[PDB]
Amino acid sequence: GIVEQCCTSICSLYQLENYCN
Amino acid sequence: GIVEQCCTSICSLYQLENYCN
Amino acid sequence: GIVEQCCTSICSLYQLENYCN
Amino acid sequence: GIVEQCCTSICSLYQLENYCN
Amino acid sequence: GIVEQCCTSICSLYQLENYCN
Amino acid sequence: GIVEQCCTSICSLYQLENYCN
Amino acid sequence: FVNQHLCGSHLVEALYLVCGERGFFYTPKT
Amino acid sequence: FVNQHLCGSHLVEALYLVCGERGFFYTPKT
Amino acid sequence: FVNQHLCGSHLVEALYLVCGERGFFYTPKT
Amino acid sequence: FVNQHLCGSHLVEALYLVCGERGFFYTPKT
Amino acid sequence: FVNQHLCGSHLVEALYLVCGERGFFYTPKT
Amino acid sequence: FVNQHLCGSHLVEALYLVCGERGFFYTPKT
Ligand SMILES: [Cl-]
Ligand SMILES: [Cl-]
Ligand SMILES: [Cl-]
Ligand SMILES: [Cl-]
Ligand SMILES: [Zn+2]
Ligand SMILES: [Zn+2]
Structure with missing residues (x-):
């Protein structure tokens, strides 16, 4: 998800x- | 400047x- | 809500x- | 110590x- | 103390x- | 430069x- | 622990600290 | 805007700035 | 996005978020 | 509460939130 | 350097910056 | 003062503390 994507890639x-919201 | 635009104002x-840059 | 409970209050x-979640 | 533990493990x-205090 | 020296004052x-330490 | 030096070394x-400024 | 004033980005840092992997919602409109 | 590399609490700070008063949900895997 | 009050270190965090690799200047005297 | 992985300044932020007005001591090795 | 107002979590970030490996104490009660 | 290991947003925080009202320029490579 976003949390992981921002951290492992960009x-x-x-x-x-x-x-x- | 930036302080006026973004801190003092919004x-x-x-x-x-x-x-x- | 959260702002009232934790920022405005304590x-x-x-x-x-x-x-x- | 705590400083190192929090960083190298959890x-x-x-x-x-x-x-x- | 620190709060008085650095937050309340400058x-x-x-x-x-x-x-x- | 400084940005890189602070991060890759000290x-x-x-x-x-x-x-x- | 303690009770303190937690506002804005400090409030969300605290939610991240307390919730972590659970996740959280920050919904100031309420 | 530029692309972002954001881990841990830095992601939550970014969400805070981006969403402002709208608030947001922070939902990590697992 | 949104409009919010951004002061001090929060203002510079936001400049870093928005500018990143471009770089930026923070010149409060103006 | 959840377990924490905290390095550098992020540890000090956590201590601040946890201890509040009690204050704290930050004592790294070496 | 300079003199500025440093409060709360910003005050402790500054202590971490200035003291680092030495460690520090943050004792707002005094 | 002690030597610093500072990446990403942590560098910008340090520049902010060091420079105060003087402001600063953040100029990464590339
Ligand atoms: Cl604030
Ligand atoms: Cl502030
Ligand atoms: Cl990091
Ligand atoms: Cl503050
Ligand atoms: Zn970090
Ligand atoms: Zn603040």
């Missing part, structure tokens, strides 16, 4: 925005 | 990009 | 566990 | 509480 | 060294 | 002070 702020 | 992530 | 580490 | 909040 | 990085 | 606060 992730964007736009991908992060999907986890906002 | 700013977006886009506005913060104004201070990138 | 909360314990135990109270914070109320917001775990 | 540690709990309860172990950390021992370092409070 | 302190230098040198003053902070007063609290090293 | 750096001092005095070296960091060179990056102040």
Whole structure:
């Protein structure tokens, strides 16, 4: 998931925005 | 400047990009 | 909610566990 | 010690509480 | 103490060294 | 540069002070 | 433990500390 | 914006900045 | 995204998030 | 609470949250 | 260097920066 | 002061503490 992706590879702020309420 | 725009007032992530190199 | 309980008021580490999944 | 244990393995909040004044 | 010197008032990085072991 | 040096080896606060305005 | 004021990014750091792998929600609107 | 390499608490800080008052959910695997 | 108050070390964390490898300047005197 | 993997400054943040007004001592090896 | 206001978790981050391996005590009651 | 091992956002925090109101520039390679 996002938590793992950001850490083991990379992730964007736009991908992060999907986890906002 | 940045303190006025973002701390004293309120700013977006886009506005913060104004201070990138 | 959380802001009221923990920022505006004062909360314990135990109270914070109320917001775990 | 605690500093090293938390970093090289794992540690709990309860172990950390021992370092409070 | 530290809160009075550095939070309530204002302190230098040198003053902070007063609290090293 | 400094960013890389601090991360891959070590750096001092005095070296960091060179990056102040 | 203790009770303290925890706001903003400090509040979320504390939720991460307390919840960790469980996960958590931060929903300030309530 | 640039791509991010974020582990542990640094991910939660990023979510906080990105989502602001909307809040967010932090949901790690396992 | 959102608009929030970002001060001090939180402001610089946000600049690092947004700028990353580009770099940035933090010049509060203006 | 969950178990913690904490290095460098992240350990000090955790001690701060855990101890609150009691304060704490940070005593690494060597 | 400079003089600034350092409170709470920011104060302890600064103590960790300045003291590091020496260790430090944070004892706000005094 | 002691020597520092600082990566990512931790470097920016250190620059913030060291420079204070003077501000600073964060300029990574590439
Ligand atoms: Cl704050
Ligand atoms: Cl603050
Ligand atoms: Cl790390
Ligand atoms: Cl604060
Ligand atoms: Zn880190
Ligand atoms: Zn703060």
